[PDB]
Write a protein that binds this ligand. Structure first.
Ligand SMILES: CC(=O)N[C@@H]1[C@@H](O)[C@H](O)[C@@H](CO)O[C@H]1O
Ligand SMILES: *[C@@H]1O[C@H](CO)[C@@H](O)[C@H](O)[C@H]1NC(C)=O
Ligand SMILES: *[C@@H]1O[C@H](CO)[C@@H](O)[C@H](O)[C@H]1NC(C)=O
Ligand SMILES: *P(=O)(O)Oc1ccccc1C
Ligand SMILES: [Cl-]
Length: 527
């Protein structure tokens, strides 16, 4: 039997055999009072002590959320869908520790993406047993509230102050601080890592004074707070909270009464109205996400970044070669996962309307002008490739690069990667390339399991990535020192060196998407 005593009480785990070894999993440990009843939309309350033991032997409830129903039965989309019961009672976390119990282990804390609207820690691609086994780090991941239940904002008013889901994450980092030493973890060596909204979450913890002392280093996969989908303004969070109230018939005059009304609704009624709090949406709509609450976030984060107001430490940042492709089949005319999606100039233009609904005629045209000046000729996939690049560059790549330059300008070592490998098992079609979210299985070490139909070259690549991530967490330096590897250089501004990740040749390059990103971060914010 394997029992650990934590501040709030005893917890029992279970033994897992991985790679001829053993890993101890503590799945579903509670870290806050369930935010039910009068607690909905509030910050998370600390947990009530318990006698007896807590059986942490299965993944807990996932947080209430709408599910992707565009491709029922298709693994490509359903692998991201929640794999545990949905419930408002969902504030739990997981711990994987190597066996035997480590002495002073570096800790990796995972934060999932999901556009702040979806996600759960219990996904197969976030299984931390491989990392614990192979690198002897301890892996932690938590569930946190998403959508309106987690980001509904009536700013000021503590009944629904905004950013609750970010505070869920923060209370969990706190739990690691007070508890991880009992699991053989080193609270002084904690690395946050996350992807998409997870990565943008990590970036926000870098700015939040309440998070400063709760971690050491940070890894941001395909995401940062300066991404255009990442932070809702005070003015439009307001319109959204109100619109949600009208739709749900909770429009009151006393703001606190509106919240009280919203508290006596079935989550389904709130989930089903979330999508219409906006006049026109995009496949990348974040209807309820982070705001400037004056608490977790004390000012507009672009200002804090620009002015050096963040945790001074090392960061590891990167993106995938075809970030934008994933989103083209959730709306763009002429696009399908089931054919090669050769679209026309008119389908491209219509495609911008989908992705940039609120921008001017001139704005959509400026994008067209920048991305359609090509050569030879008359290449049928021109418009197809270009639209994917538009969405990728604007939503992910350029803000990640920009974040990194700005962060590095204040003295800290930063490391940038460009993930170029399309998985051998990718269920999506070839034209969609190296998709958003498909580096994760490599980071978490799935290809190490050689019964899982990955090629050997993928096993090797994953092993190197796992080693780089682990060395970054342990030592702030994402090198692989033992197997004649390419050194990964710091990303300085001006020089802007980055490292390519692929199965064949690993290369140092400079100035990723220079021309494109010049268009986005300099010209485009003016339109
Ligand atoms: C951490 C890492 O990448 N270690 C590799 C290992 O996987 C491989 O067996 C060996 C072959 O010489 O090269 C080294
Ligand atoms: C673990 O490591 C830290 C250094 O980061 C040290 O301060 C702490 O005392 C160590 N605790 C032990 C002995 O496990
Ligand atoms: C609104 O109602 C709440 C709950 O009864 C009360 O606490 C608050 O003081 C009221 N505020 C206003 C502006 O009437
Ligand atoms: P992530 O996979 O969470 O991608 C989304 C989805 C919806 C909205 C925004 C974003 C970044
Ligand atoms: Cl509080």
């Amino acid at each position: 039997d394997i029992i650990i005593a934590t501040k709030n009480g005893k917890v029992r785990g279970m033994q897992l055999t991985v790679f001829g070894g053993t890993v101890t999993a503590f799945l579903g440990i509670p870290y806050a009072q369930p935010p039910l009843g009068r607690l909905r939309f509030k910050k998370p309350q600390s947990l009530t002590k318990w006698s007896d033991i807590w059986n942490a032997t299965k993944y807990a409830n996932s947080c209430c959320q709408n599910i992707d129903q565009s491709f029922p039965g298709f693994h490509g989309s359903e692998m991201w869908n929640p794999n545990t019961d949905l419930s408002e009672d969902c504030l739990y976390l997981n711990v994987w520790i190597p066996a035997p119990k480590p002495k002073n282990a570096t800790v990796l804390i995972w934060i999932y993406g999901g556009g702040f609207q979806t996600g759960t820690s219990s996904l197969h691609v976030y299984d931390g047993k491989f990392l614990a086994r192979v690198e002897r780090v301890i892996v932690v991941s938590m569930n946190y509230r998403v959508g309106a239940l987690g980001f509904l904002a009536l700013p000021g008013n503590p009944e629904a102050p905004g950013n609750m889901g970010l505070f869920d994450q923060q209370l969990a980092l706190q739990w690691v601080q007070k508890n991880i030493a009992a699991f053989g973890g080193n609270p002084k060596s904690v690395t946050l890592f996350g992807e998409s909204a997870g990565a943008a979450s990590v970036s926000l913890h870098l700015l939040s004074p309440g998070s400063h002392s709760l971690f050491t280093r940070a890894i941001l996969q395909s995401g940062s707070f300066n991404a255009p989908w990442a932070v809702t303004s005070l003015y439009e969070a307001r319109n959204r909270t109100l619109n949600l109230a009208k739709l749900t018939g909770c429009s009151r005059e006393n703001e606190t009464e509106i919240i009280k009304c919203l508290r006596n609704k079935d989550p389904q009624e709130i989930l089903l109205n979330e999508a219409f709090v906006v006049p026109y949406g995009t496949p990348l709509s974040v209807n309820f996400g982070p705001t400037v609450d004056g608490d977790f976030l004390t000012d507009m984060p672009d200002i804090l970044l620009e002015l050096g107001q963040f945790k001074k430490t090392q960061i590891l940042v990167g993106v995938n070669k075809d970030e934008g492709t994933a989103f083209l089949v959730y709306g763009a005319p002429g696009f399908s996962k089931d054919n090669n999606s050769i679209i026309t100039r008119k389908e491209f233009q219509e495609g911008l309307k989908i992705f940039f609904p609120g921008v001017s005629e001139f704005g959509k045209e400026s994008i067209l002008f920048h991305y359609t000046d090509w050569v030879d000729d008359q290449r049928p996939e021109n418009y197809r490739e270009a639209l994917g690049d538009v969405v990728g560059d604007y939503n992910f790549i350029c803000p990640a690069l920009e974040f990194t330059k700005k962060f590095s300008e204040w003295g800290n070592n930063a490391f940038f990667y460009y993930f170029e490998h399309r998985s051998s098992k990718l269920p999506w079609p070839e034209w969609m390339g190296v998709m958003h979210g498909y580096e994760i299985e490599f980071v978490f070490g799935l290809p190490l399991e050689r019964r899982d139909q990955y090629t050997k070259a993928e096993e090797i690549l994953s092993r190197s990535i796992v080693k780089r991530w682990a060395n970054f967490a342990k030592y702030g330096n994402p090198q692989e020192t033992q197997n004649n590897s390419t050194s990964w250089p710091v990303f300085k501004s001006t020089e802007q060196k980055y490292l390519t990740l692929n199965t064949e040749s690993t290369r140092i390059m400079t100035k990723l998407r220079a021309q494109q990103c010049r268009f986005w971060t300099s010209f485009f914010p003016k339109v």
